[PDB]
Amino acid sequence: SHYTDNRYKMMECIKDAGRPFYPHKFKISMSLPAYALKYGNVENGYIDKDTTLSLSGRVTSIRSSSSKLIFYDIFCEEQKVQIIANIMEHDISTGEFSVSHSEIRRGDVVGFTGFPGKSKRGELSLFSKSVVLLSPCYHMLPTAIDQEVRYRQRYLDLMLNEESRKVFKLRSRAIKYIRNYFDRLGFLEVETPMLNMIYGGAAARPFITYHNELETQLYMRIATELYLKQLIVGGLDKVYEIGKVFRNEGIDLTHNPEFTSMEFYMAYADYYDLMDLTEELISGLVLEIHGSLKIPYHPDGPEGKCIEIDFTTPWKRFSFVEEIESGLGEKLKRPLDSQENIDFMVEMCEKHEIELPHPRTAAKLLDKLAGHFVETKCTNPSFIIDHPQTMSPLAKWHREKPEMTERFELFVLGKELCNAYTELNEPLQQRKFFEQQADAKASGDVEACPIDETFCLALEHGLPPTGGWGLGIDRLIMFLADKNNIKEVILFPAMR
Amino acid sequence: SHYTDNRYKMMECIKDAGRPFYPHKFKISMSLPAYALKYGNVENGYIDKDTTLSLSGRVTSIRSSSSKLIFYDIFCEEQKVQIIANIMEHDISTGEFSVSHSEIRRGDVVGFTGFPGKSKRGELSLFSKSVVLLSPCYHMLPTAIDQEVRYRQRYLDLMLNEESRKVFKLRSRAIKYIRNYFDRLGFLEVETPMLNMIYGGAAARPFITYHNELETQLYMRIATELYLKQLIVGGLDKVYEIGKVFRNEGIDLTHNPEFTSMEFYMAYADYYDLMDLTEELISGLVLEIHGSLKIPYHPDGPEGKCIEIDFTTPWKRFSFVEEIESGLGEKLKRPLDSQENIDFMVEMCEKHEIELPHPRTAAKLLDKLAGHFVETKCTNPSFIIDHPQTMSPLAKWHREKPEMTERFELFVLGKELCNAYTELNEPLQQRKFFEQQADAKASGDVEACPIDETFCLALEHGLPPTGGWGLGIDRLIMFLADKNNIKEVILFPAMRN
Ligand SMILES: N=[N+]=NCCOCCOCCOCCNC(=O)c1ccc(S(=O)(=O)Nc2cc(F)cc3c(=O)cc(C(=O)NCC4CCCCC4)oc23)cc1
Ligand SMILES: N=[N+]=NCCOCCOCCOCCNC(=O)c1ccc(S(=O)(=O)Nc2cc(F)cc3c(=O)cc(C(=O)NCC4CCCCC4)oc23)cc1
Ligand SMILES: N[C@@H](CCCC[NH3+])C(=O)O
Ligand SMILES: N[C@@H](CCCC[NH3+])C(=O)O
């Protein structure tokens, strides 16, 4: 690009001529929002020539109306201010008017000094005496924005697209709301390690790395569960953690291998308590943001249809196995993890043209059948409940239903948002389920985790009856901000 | 251990007999702190037989005073309550008194139901009618806390040691205080990626991993700086991020390869602004926690001496080069990155018995000389300022001092707490500094980073004049909580197996 090489040449020329070259410090009189709050409502043509102010922002527009008069727009902290540069007001000690303004381009970060007020046409303005080039833009900027450029050059998206800045402000506001809710209930916010000898607490492949000091391979965490439960053994009673987890899987509209999860553990809660809390927390946050529990969603982007998501509580419950059996029009075989039921579920996947998992474990077949028959019914927030033990190695046995657990998932628009259960606190069964998971792993289940003897020893010290819970923060922001691509709610998503 | 196998046998016997086996839900009437607040001021011997309450906690003490009378202490949410179990009050529908209490051991998580009040001796008590075993402890618990066990089995440390629970509560309190300070200034809290094609923004070896979907090697971040600065190009004006960084270095009292850093970027700040902010933020937090700016520290653990750290402002400033030259009694050679000055610094290291770095770059030699002559003077919070450009590839040239930058580090008790500068926003020099870093890396500098063309392209879109800043959260908690081992302020530090 000629424009880039020429801009480097003009900056070298400015430097050699002893003209202002990347000043270290520009002292603003006030922010552009403060400027608009103070002067935004003066009458048309108002000027205070007794007040000189310094303002700064990025140039969004330059219009030289005449040889004597240049109009700028500058933008900073979500406020536009017009700058009116009249040759008659120009401070010639900064250079000749034409020379000073010839150094400025659209996209440059600049300072101005001048008098406040409003143009005769009613535009909030600074009537400038000087212009200082603080940091030039070496590229011709589009006038507006190509999802690929938006994600690979996120600074361009944020510079040019108000909608993008709104999503990240909403993300921060939602995380703050969630911390406030738990902090006021007396929860302790904690950090657990991201690099560990073992990994577990979800069904995903890990990232693997090497630690020079410990001279060992380590795994990045796929979840926080196994460490957070140790803090409940430790008596901290109520803990939460919001942070990154690393699942070495696919990239698509709803998956980013690196993503933000929240988990909390509450001593003395069961999964019934956690369903009520999920409804209160999420409906409260939706109300705070939207002013009602019925909110818009564009499942095919903003050029597509608009649907309504209804967060009115209480939410629909679907029983995992019963809803599959309704879909199939016949019963799964018992026990659910019998070879008989594995063969039957393979037959049902073939009959209903459901892609088979590998390996063909009872757990992975149940998951495929749920995906086809149950998750697809979950448009409004819906709980899928009472998952089989065989697919829920850390969930406590159901107090009424053989082979099931006290588990739920929250689904919105067919996507998982939450996963929660009455925690398994019985170490004999826990060890058995970990051995079964390790067997599935050794048979080629790349999503099954190795045994964690440190965790089993922690359970042997007595985990109180406990309820635990996870939330996908990125997926939450997708619904709250109405984005159908997870890359919209992550500042720098990893790209090909 | 016989004790563990026998406890598994007792639980199997309970299960087979149809007796309570890991109840799913115990409904407490109120927390133990709420119980103490409600009944803590009744007169000695008060009992309300008209009120039945359910309480739960971990058994810290069992004393069978007689065949008819058992005293328990339970603990939950930082409150102890005594349970008085008299055979005459026992609910026989839960089993015979002897059978019900025979199932309970020190360390068990249990529920009790009973009448509230106070023993004749004045002890806050529940006069129990029933006991339920909720989650047994299969191990004989030590009566008190070994560092190794405390770190490998943190649940035992937290269960038995109030001082350990206090450290983690103080850590959460300090992080909340810091978020509040920046949130009230209009900062946006952000998340930037931990797994990237490139790494940069500090001087450390990286962790390496492999991404299945992208079919590529990636690095874990060593810092957040290069992404956060792009958000200031993006016009977000004030951003911060508190999160993990991964530096594939040593483990010692003040280093954990995985640790928590905070970075912030403020448009239109310079390093003078950031020194004043550092003083206000840190002195404010110390005052909030301690009620003064002079706080105790045990540099050799609690059996050793106690010193005082004084956070009173203004903090001492040491100029990097001038303080080295005071130490040497003579001047470094100019330019600082000349072979002449490299040879001279090697001669000075040999003269003063300072261990040489490898490779012998101007930057690494300057660092060794600072470590010997300047960092050692930093007991109270002290700013080391105006670092040479050659060791500061992302710091803007000093507006007054040739070859220096607008940089500071904050040191406390000779340890780095903060690193900050007027940000370099001139892309020609930036590219040159990155090329010099890549050269140092190819010459054997394992702490020098590869060039980041994505970052250079971002600078070509115009980074406003900016001030940026990093803080080691763990090291801050070490000073605030008076711990001399970083493993004291990290819940689960990774240990040798
Ligand atoms: N092409 N090519 N070339 C290379 C050859 O291919 C090799 C690589 O294959 C990739 C294809 O993989 C297919 C098989 N794998 C899966 O189908 C799979 C999907 C999801 C999962 S997951 O663990 O249940 N979930 C998640 C996994 C993930 F990577 C990202 C997210 C995420 O961004 C958000 C959430 C979330 O917010 N979920 C909600 C929960 C709630 C409870 C707390 C945690 C979050 O969940 C996620 C596991 C496996
Ligand atoms: N035995 N054996 N086995 C195998 C053989 O051993 C091979 C391995 O060699 C180990 C020996 O390593 C010696 C060489 N390397 C260093 O000496 C070194 C030291 C520090 C650094 S560092 O990047 O400047 N700093 C930090 C690096 C680190 F790993 C942890 C921390 C930390 O826990 C906290 C802080 C902090 O709070 N610092 C403050 C800053 C402020 C600004 C923001 C960020 C934090 O800083 C840290 C880099 C290198
Ligand atoms: N670790 C779970 C979330 C918590 C489930 C209940 N303990 C997950 O990542 O899905
Ligand atoms: N990235 C730096 C902290 C910020 C320095 C100023 N931009 C470090 O880790 O030391």
Sign for the pseudo-dihedral over CA of B136, B138, B141, B145: negative
C-alpha neighbours within 13 Å on the C-beta side of residue A231: 30
Mutate-to-test residue for ligand 4 from B192, B220, B224, B225, highest number of ligand atoms within 8 A of CB: B225
Q: Are A470 and A420 in contact (CB under 8 A)?
A: yes
Taking the C-alpha atoms of residue B488 and residue B368, their distance in angstroms, rounded to an integer, is 28
The label of the residue with tokens 């795994």 reads A219
β-strands A258-267, A294-297: how paired?
unpaired
Token digits for A489? 């709610």
The label of the residue with tokens 């750290």 reads B309
Taking the C-alpha atoms of residue B209 and residue B213, their distance in angstroms, rounded to an integer, is 13
Q: For residue A201, how far is its CA from the centre of ligand 3 (angstroms)?
A: 6
Q: Are B345 and B334 in contact (CB under 8 A)?
A: no
Q: Are A438 and A334 in contact (CB under 8 A)?
A: no
Strand partners, A307: A297
What is chain B's alpha carbon radius of gyration, rounded to the nearest angstrom? Answer: 30
Q: Are A14 and A103 in contact (CB under 8 A)?
A: yes
Closest CB from B141, B251, B462 relative to A213: B251
Q: Are B442 and B386 in contact (CB under 8 A)?
A: no
Taking the C-alpha atoms of residue B401 and residue B415, their distance in angstroms, rounded to an integer, is 26
Among chain B residues, the shortest Cα distance to A153 is held by B458
Q: How far B475 CA sits from the closest chain A CA (Å)?
A: 15
B233:A260 CB<8 A = no
Q: Are A193 and B266 in contact (CB under 8 A)?
A: no
Q: For residue B224, how far is its CA from the centre of ligand 4 (angstroms)?
A: 8
Contacts of A98 (CB under 8 A, 6+ apart): none
Closest CB from B137, B190, B214 relative to A462: B137
Return the amino acid letter for A163: E
Taking the C-alpha atoms of residue A268 and residue A237, their distance in angstroms, rounded to an integer, is 8
Look at phi and psi of residue A143 and say left if phi exceeds 0, alpha if psi is from -120 to 50, else beta: alpha
Disruptive mutation site among A11, A24, A263 for chain B (greatest number of B CBs within 10 Å): A24
Token digits for B441? 């890396």
Taking the C-alpha atoms of residue B364 and residue B375, their distance in angstroms, rounded to an integer, is 15
Token digits for B290? 């301690």
Token digits for B116? 């509230």
Sign for the pseudo-dihedral over CA of A393, A398, A402, A404: negative
Please choose, from the candidates B246, B141, B391, the residue with its C-alpha nearest in 3D space to the C-alpha of residue A235: B141
CB-based burial, B248-262: b 16+ in 10 Å, e otherwise: bbebeebebbbbbbb
Which of the ligands is closest to the CA of residue B415? 2
Return the amino acid letter for B28: I
Please choose, from the candidates B327, B354, B324, the residue with its C-alpha nearest in 3D space to the C-alpha of residue B336: B324
B251:A214 CB<8 A = yes
Taking the C-alpha atoms of residue A451 and residue A456, their distance in angstroms, rounded to an integer, is 9
Strand partners, A141: none
How many C-beta atoms surround the C-beta of residue B144 within 10 A? 6
Q: For residue B237, how far is its CA from the centre of ligand 3 (angstroms)?
A: 36
Which of the ligands is closest to the CA of residue A392? 3
Q: For residue A256, how far is its CA from the centre of ligand 1 (angstroms)?
A: 7
How many C-beta atoms surround the C-beta of residue B147 within 10 A? 12
Among chain A residues, the shortest Cα distance to B150 is held by A234
From residue B426, give the alpha-carbon distance in Å to each of A137, B111, B461.
11, 66, 11
Is ligand 4 within 6 A of the CB of residue B468? yes
The label of the residue with tokens 């440190």 reads A454
From residue B409, give the alpha-carbon distance in Å to each of A208, A332, B481.
34, 65, 22
C-alpha neighbours within 13 Å on the C-beta side of residue B128: 29
Is ligand 3 within 6 A of the CB of residue A470? yes
B208:A209 CB<8 A = yes
Taking the C-alpha atoms of residue B53 and residue B114, their distance in angstroms, rounded to an integer, is 6
Is ligand 4 within 6 A of the CB of residue B467? no
Instruction: Give SS3 for B433.
Output: helix
Q: Are B426 and A22 in contact (CB under 8 A)?
A: yes
Contacts of A371 (CB under 8 A, 6+ apart): A354
Closest CB from A159, A243, A454 relative to B234: A159
Dihedral over alpha carbons B427, B433, B438, B444 (to 10 degrees)? -170
Taking the C-alpha atoms of residue A396 and residue A231, their distance in angstroms, rounded to an integer, is 18
Q: Are A272 and A288 in contact (CB under 8 A)?
A: no
Q: Are A462 and B108 in contact (CB under 8 A)?
A: yes
Please choose, from the candidates B121, B122, B111, B109, the residue with its C-alpha nearest in 3D space to the C-alpha of residue B85: B111
Taking the C-alpha atoms of residue A368 and residue A357, their distance in angstroms, rounded to an integer, is 7
Size of interface A-B (CB pairs under 8 A): 300
Q: List, edge to edge, every strand of the sheet that includes B407-412.
A: B188-189, B238-246, B258-267, B466-472, B415-422, B407-412, B382-385, B316-319
Among chain A residues, the shortest Cα distance to B172 is held by A189
A16 exposure class (CB count in 10 Å sphere: 0-12, 13-18, 19+): exposed
Which of the ligands is closest to the CA of residue B469? 4
Peptide bond into A296 cis (omega under 30): no
Detail the DSSP E strand segments found in B378-438: 382-385, 407-412, 415-422
Token digits for A244? 């990154």
Determined by: X-ray
Q: For residue B278, what is the enclosing H or E element?
A: helix B271-290
Please choose, from the candidates B83, B54, B20, the residue with its C-alpha nearest in 3D space to the C-alpha of residue A268: B54
Taking the C-alpha atoms of residue B272 and residue A25, their distance in angstroms, rounded to an integer, is 10
**Cβ neighbours of A490 in B, within 8 Å:** 191, 193
Q: How far A134 CA sits from the closest chain B CA (Å)?
A: 7
Distance of CA B162 to the CA centre of its chain: 17
How many C-beta atoms surround the C-beta of residue A166 within 10 A? 12
Is ligand 1 within 6 A of the CB of residue B50? no
Ligand 4 atom 3: residue of nearest CA: B470
Residue-by-residue DSSP string for B318-330: EEHHHHHHHHHTS
Q: Are B59 and B106 in contact (CB under 8 A)?
A: yes
Q: Which residue stretches of B291-374 are H helix?
A: 320-328, 339-351, 362-373
**Cβ neighbours of A462 in B, within 8 Å:** 58, 107-109, 135-138
SS (H, E, C) B143-164: CCCCHHHHHHCHHHHHHHCHHH
Instruction: Give SS3 for B210.
Output: strand
**Cβ neighbours of A248 in B, within 8 Å:** 211-213
Is ligand 3 within 6 A of the CB of residue A472? no
Please choose, from the candidates B277, B190, B185, the residue with its C-alpha nearest in 3D space to the C-alpha of residue B232: B190
Return phi, psi of residue A325, to 5°: -65, -40
Q: Are B464 and B232 in contact (CB under 8 A)?
A: yes
Ligand 2 atom 46: residue of nearest CA: B255
Taking the C-alpha atoms of residue B393 and residue B434, their distance in angstroms, rounded to an integer, is 7
From residue B435, give the alpha-carbon distance in Å to each of B220, B395, B496.
22, 15, 38
Taking the C-alpha atoms of residue B34 and residue B236, their distance in angstroms, rounded to an integer, is 45
Taking the C-alpha atoms of residue A205 and residue A248, their distance in angstroms, rounded to an integer, is 5
Closest CB from B137, B231, B464 relative to A134: B464
Q: For residue B449, how far is its CA from the centre of ligand 4 (angstroms)?
A: 14
Instruction: Give SS3 for B22.
Output: coil
Instruction: Give SS3 for B349.
Output: helix
Which of the ligands is closest to the CA of residue B195? 1
Please choose, from the candidates B272, B180, B190, the residue with its C-alpha nearest in 3D space to the C-alpha of residue B238: B190
Please choose, from the candidates B478, B418, B475, B480, the residue with its C-alpha nearest in 3D space to the C-alpha of residue B288: B480
Taking the C-alpha atoms of residue A193 and residue A437, their distance in angstroms, rounded to an integer, is 23
What is chain A's alpha carbon radius of gyration, rounded to the nearest angstrom? Answer: 30
Atom of ligand 3 nearest to the CA of A265: 7
Q: How far B3 CA sits from the closest chain A CA (Å)?
A: 12
Among chain A residues, the shortest Cα distance to B491 is held by A192
B134:A464 CB<8 A = yes
Taking the C-alpha atoms of residue B221 and residue B470, their distance in angstroms, rounded to an integer, is 14
Residue-by-residue DSSP string for B165-181: HHHHHHHHHHHHHHHHH
Q: Are A233 and A461 in contact (CB under 8 A)?
A: yes
Angle at A451 between CA A446 and CA A452, to 5 degrees: 125
Instruction: Note the residue count of chain B.
Output: 497
From residue B280, give the alpha-carbon distance in Å to each of A28, A175, B274, B421, B478.
21, 26, 10, 17, 19
Q: For residue B258, what is the enclosing H or E element?
A: strand B258-267
Q: Are A295 and A476 in contact (CB under 8 A)?
A: no
Disruptive mutation site among A207, A220, A406, A490 for chain B (greatest number of B CBs within 10 Å): A207
Instruction: Give SS3 for B220.
Output: strand
β-strands B109-118, B53-66: how paired?
antiparallel
Q: Are B468 and B266 in contact (CB under 8 A)?
A: yes
Disruptive mutation site among B13, B182, B213 for chain A (greatest number of A CBs within 10 Å): B213
Sign for the pseudo-dihedral over CA of B360, B366, B372, B376: negative
Token digits for B457? 């392209």
Contacts of A165 (CB under 8 A, 6+ apart): A78, A158, B234, B235, B236
Strand partners, B74: B59, B81
Please choose, from the candidates B294, B256, B298, B287, the residue with its C-alpha nearest in 3D space to the C-alpha of residue B474: B256
Taking the C-alpha atoms of residue A452 and residue A462, their distance in angstroms, rounded to an integer, is 16
Look at phi and psi of residue B211 and say left if phi exceeds 0, alpha if psi is from -120 to 50, else beta: beta
Taking the C-alpha atoms of residue A210 and residue B242, their distance in angstroms, rounded to an integer, is 24
How many C-beta atoms surround the C-beta of residue A59 within 10 A? 23
The label of the residue with tokens 């000898």 reads A197
**Cβ neighbours of A220 in B, within 8 Å:** 209
Taking the C-alpha atoms of residue B471 and residue B221, their distance in angstroms, rounded to an integer, is 16
Disruptive mutation site among A74, A132, A161, A209 for chain B (greatest number of B CBs within 10 Å): A209
Instruction: Give SS3 for B72.
Output: strand
B257:A213 CB<8 A = yes
Token digits for B3? 């004790």
Taking the C-alpha atoms of residue B65 and residue B209, their distance in angstroms, rounded to an integer, is 60
B155:A24 CB<8 A = no
Please choose, from the candidates A57, A119, A128, the residue with its C-alpha nearest in 3D space to the C-alpha of residue A87: A128
Token digits for A306? 């608009």
Token digits for B282? 């840190």
Q: Furthest-apart CA pair in chain B: how many Å? A: 92
Taking the C-alpha atoms of residue B485 and residue B262, their distance in angstroms, rounded to an integer, is 20
Angle at A458 between CA B53 and CA A260, to 5 degrees: 95
Distance of CA A152 to the CA centre of its chain: 17
Ligand 1 atom 42: residue of nearest CA: A470
Contacts of A197 (CB under 8 A, 6+ apart): A216, A218, A219, B494, B497
Mutate-to-test residue for ligand 2 from B220, B259, B263, highest number of ligand atoms within 8 A of CB: B259
Return the amino acid letter for B93: S
Q: How far A439 CA sits from the closest chain B CA (Å)?
A: 23
Please choose, from the candidates A88, A169, A189, A18, the residue with its C-alpha nearest in 3D space to the C-alpha of residue A489: A169
Q: For residue B256, how far is its CA from the centre of ligand 2 (angstroms)?
A: 7
SS (H, E, C) chain A: CHHHHHHHHHHHHHHHCCCCCCCCCCCCCCCHHHHHHHHCCCCCCCECCCCCEEEEEEEEEEEEEECCEEEEEEEECCEEEEEEEEHHHCCHHHCCHHHHHHCCCCCCEEEEEEEEEECCCCCEEEEEEEEEEEECCCCCCCCCCCHHHHHHCHHHHHHHCHHHHHHHHHHHHHHHHHHHHHHHCCCEECCCCCEECCCCCCCCCCCEEEECCCCEEEEECCCCHHHHHHHHHCCCCEEEEEEEEECCCCCECCECCEEEEEEEEEECCCHHHHHHHHHHHHHHHHHHHHCCCEEEECCCCCCCCCEEEECCCCCEEEEHHHHHHHHHCCCCCCCCCCHHHHHHHHHHHHHCCCCCCCCCCHHHHHHHHHHHHCHHHCCCCEEEECCEHHHCCCECECCCCCCEECEEEEEECCEEEEEEEEECCCHHHHHHHHHHHHHHHHCCCCCCCCCCHHHHHHHCCCCCCEEEEEEEHHHHHHHHHCCCCHHHHCCCCCCC
Taking the C-alpha atoms of residue A418 and residue A263, their distance in angstroms, rounded to an integer, is 9
How many C-beta atoms surround the C-beta of residue A492 within 10 A? 20
Closest CB from B22, B158, B227 relative to A426: B22
Taking the C-alpha atoms of residue B102 and residue B7, their distance in angstroms, rounded to an integer, is 12
Atom of ligand 3 nearest to the CA of A201: 1
